[PDB]
Paper text:
Keratinases are classified in the superfamily of subtilisin-like proteases, belonging to the serine protease (S8 family). In this study, we identified a thermostable [name] (MtaKer) from the thermophile strain, [name], which grows at 55–65 °C11. Like many subtilisin-like serine proteases, bioinformatic analysis indicates that Mtai_v1c14470 consists of three parts, including signal peptide, N-terminal pro-peptide (N-pro), and mature protease, and has the three highly conserved catalytic triad residues Asp39, His72, and Ser224. Unlike most reported keratinases, which are only active at pH 6–9 and temperatures 25–50 °C4, 8, rMtaKer has keratinolytic activities at temperatures ranging from 25 to 75 °C and pH from 4 to 11, with the optimal temperature and pH at 65 °C and pH 10.
The crystal structure of mature rMtaKer was determined at a resolution of 1.50 Å and contained three monomers in an asymmetric unit. Each monomer consists of the central seven-stranded parallel β sheets flanking by six α helices and four β sheets made of two anti-parallel strands and possesses the conserved catalytic triad Asp39, His72 and Ser224. Two calcium ions and two disulfide bridges were also found in the structure of rMtaKer. The first calcium ion (1Ca), involved in stabilizing the surface loop between α1 and β2, is coordinated by Oδ1 of Asp11 and Asp14, carbonyl-oxygen of Asp11 and Thr23, Oγ of Ser21, Oε of Gln15, and one water molecule in a pentagonal bipyramidal manner. The second calcium (2Ca) makes contact with the main-chain carbonyl oxygen atoms of the Val172, Gly175, Thr177, and two water molecules. The first disulfide bond, Cys69-Cys101, connects the loops which are involved in substrate-binding. The second disulfide bond, Cys165-Cys196, is close to the 2Ca-binding site and the region carrying residues of the S1 active-site pocket, which was termed S1–S4 according to a previous report. Each C-terminus His-tag protrudes into the adjacent monomer as a substrate, resulting the unexpected His-tag removal at Tyr278. The remaining residues at the C-terminal end (Tyr278-Glu279-Asn280-Leu281-Tyr282) of rMtaKer was buried in the active-site cavity of the adjacent subunit. Our crystal structure clearly shows that Ser224 acts as a nucleophile to attack the carbonyl carbon of the scissile peptide bond on Tyr282 and forms a tetrahedral acyl enzyme intermediate which can be stabilized by the oxyanion hole of Asn159 and Thr223.
Residue numbers in the entry: 1 to 282
The structure:
Amino acid sequence: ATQTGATWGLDRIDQRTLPLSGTFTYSNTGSGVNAYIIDTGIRVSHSEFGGRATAVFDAIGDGQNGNDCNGHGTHVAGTVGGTVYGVAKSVRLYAVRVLNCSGSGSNSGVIAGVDWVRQNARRPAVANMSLGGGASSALDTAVNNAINAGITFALAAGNSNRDACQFSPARVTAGITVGATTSTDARASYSNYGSCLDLFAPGSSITSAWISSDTSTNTISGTSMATPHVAGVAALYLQSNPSASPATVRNAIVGNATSGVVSNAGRRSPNLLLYSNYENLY
Ligand SMILES: [Ca+2]
Ligand SMILES: [Ca+2]
């Protein structure tokens, strides 16, 4: 299927080279795949989700019961799986709320959320963590444990224009750690960089769902916006390869990526940009 009038980040990932086509083509939809959005929640009623999003976990305890009162989680969910703004347009989406209305949360609550996904995820599964903070061996361990249980993790690199290896969970090697690019294929000014990245994806001026209403949208930037394009592609891959381990998924995403197109990628960064096209028997 080919989507016309596609937003730029989707437009970019289905092709190797610029210029943008205005189109996003996909052969799969992530039907049958489960995507756990570890974030500020999801406004599950949003039109973008068509009933495919549900709230499953909330460590904040403010009475939202997984609903998003920030926007970030909804926006991220929309990039993974929204009808118009998403990569994997039939994926199931699950709100694992570990951040509050200001996008803040205890480390303990984040670990609880990861561990909930380890124990309760429906396979095949992808988890998205567009969040981070200071180095935390406990959180690294929770993420490693969940990956060892068979769940692919997409991890934001962070937004300090620093080496990502200083941050958790970006420094978890087994997770797919994602830096941000702009529409000109430059590394975004704020993107973290370095050898803990796996690849880059579109992260600046990304349009997706928001929380002001069930038809709202917002256009924002971050490694938080890059990450869900990777999670989405992982869902596309997992629909065709439902028993694939996280190592196999990571190798398939990194091995398919477009090489050499990211400008100013930063010291020791892999010069690789997400690419969504996988071939199939006919
Ligand atoms: Ca395109
Ligand atoms: Ca990693």
